[PDB]
A paper describes a structure:
The nucleophilicity of S221 results from its interactions with the catalytic histidine (H64) and aspartic acid (D32) that together form a charge relay system.
The two S101K mutants are denoted as RAS-specific proteases RASProtease(N) and RASProtease(I). To understand the structural basis for specificity and cofactor activation, we determined crystal structures of RASProtease(I) alone, in complex with YSAM and QEEYSAM product peptides, and with imidazole. In both cases, a catalytic amino acid is mutated to Gly and the vacated space is occupied by a network of conserved water molecules in the absence of the cognate cofactor. Structures of RASProtease(I) without imidazole have three conserved waters (19, 81, and 122) that interact with Oδ1 and Oδ2 of D32, CO of S125, NH of G64, Oγ of S62, and Oγ of S221. When imidazole binds, these waters are displaced, the imidazole nitrogens H-bond to Oδ1 and Oδ2 of D32 and Oγ of S221, and the charge relay system is reconstituted.
Numbering used by the authors: 1 to 74, 84 to 275
Write the structure that this text describes.
Amino acid sequence: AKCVSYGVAQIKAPALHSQGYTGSNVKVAILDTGIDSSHPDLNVAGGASFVPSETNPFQDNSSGGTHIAGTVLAVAPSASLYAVKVLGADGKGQASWIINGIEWAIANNMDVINMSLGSPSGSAAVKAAVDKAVASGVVVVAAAGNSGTSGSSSTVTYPAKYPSVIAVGAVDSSNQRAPFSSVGPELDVMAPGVSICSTLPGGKYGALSGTSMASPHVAGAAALILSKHPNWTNTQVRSSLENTATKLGDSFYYGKGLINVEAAAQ
Ligand SMILES: [K+]
Ligand SMILES: [K+]
Ligand SMILES: [K+]
């Protein structure tokens, strides 16, 4: 990664890199607004668009998908990225498009799905598709939501709110919960999500904040773990990330805490 970011060291990814693990031979689908495949610092191995008004997955007219891609590669520099466009330039999409992306990911033997997207209400049909992905062995990671708090109510967005999905909230560089990061019993782990510098469309770079930025740290961590332990199931990868996280506070706000990929990979 050409842009410096504190998040990679924060989750202890350099310890894996020192051990010689960089996520080789791990297929990571980024279900988002596309990936700018012409960016000099990205390589994209394949993809598909399901957004009828935006038919190229290898361009990104929003910026999120590219940024997210860059984070996954900063964490797991050898991962293979797949651009699955399920959101348009406004970062919005239909539930069916998300389903078609998930199905494409299953058909094309992805190891990890990253969904940095969140609907407040969810879709029964999306649930079925994510659960199917997880049953087929895919590690499914999603942004917990940028809906802050709501007293004692959960604010975790769908599809993160489903139990089959790893819901990733955002901490800042001080390991404090970001004011926007959703909360609730469904929140699983935290990762860096404030002012994360990564790739942007048109060969650019810049900081973005959100649980969408936290999620790909965890998708990259999953790739690092699978490169060290290619025989582990998705169940085993998830368990390793949740069980070895660094506790940060009440699980309503922090889940199990900050992922620690060095501990998870032991
Ligand atoms: K490129
Ligand atoms: K969850
Ligand atoms: K929780």
